[PDB]
Design a protein around this ligand. Structure first.
Ligand SMILES: [Zn+2]
Ligand SMILES: [Zn+2]
Ligand SMILES: [Zn+2]
Length: 178
């Protein structure tokens, strides 16, 4: 097994996957690493199993159809994995915790949003469709762009949104387009 967390790339108290060489901090994995369960398989492994059990699940899909799916166990898992893929980027730090807004010439957003809030919401089963999760994720970046205006810090929102969107298209097998 790897000697650093797959998510944050630090050492520490790591739990090792039994079916692949990845390791995790307890609260870096999503869902948080389960108490017992020997063997234990990480989210990467669980996602790969879904794909392998239904090879056709990799054929292209329309975003509109994906968004209307109910959050049954497999879609819950896919959103958890998508959230984890964002935390895997170090620039996620900017979007993890609850923001505050006091900048001359700007007003804060009407509906603040942040990664840890989406994490809690997934954990508490507050989303009934994929759309709820994706709307909250996109809102994080949209709030940032609107607040920071022409400051070059707006680019951090663009950058992390691009990680989100690429992983969304991969995990949910969105039909490739020009
Ligand atoms: Zn970690
Ligand atoms: Zn694994
Ligand atoms: Zn099948």
């Amino acid at each position: 097994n790897s000697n650093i967390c797959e998510v944050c790339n630090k050492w520490g108290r790591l739990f090792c996957c039994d079916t692949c060489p990845r390791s995790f901090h307890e609260h870096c994995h999503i869902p948080s690493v389960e108490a017992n369960k020997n063997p234990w398989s990480c989210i990467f492994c669980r996602i790969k199993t879904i794909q392998e059990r239904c090879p056709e699940s990799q054929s292209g899909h329309q975003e509109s159809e994906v968004l209307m799916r109910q959050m049954l166990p497999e879609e819950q898992l896919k959103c958890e994995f998508l959230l984890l893929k964002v935390y895997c980027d170090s620039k996620s730090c900017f979007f993890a915790s609850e923001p505050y807004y006091n900048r001359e010439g700007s007003q804060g957003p009407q509906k603040p949003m942040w990664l840890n809030k989406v994490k809690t919401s997934l954990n508490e089963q507050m989303y009934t469709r994929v759309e709820g999760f994706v709307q909250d994720m996109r809102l994080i970046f949209h709030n940032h762009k609107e607040f920071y205006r022409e400051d070059k810090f707006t680019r951090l929102g663009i950058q992390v949104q691009d990680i989100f969107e690429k992983n969304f298209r991969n995990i949910f097998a969105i039909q490739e387009t020009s």
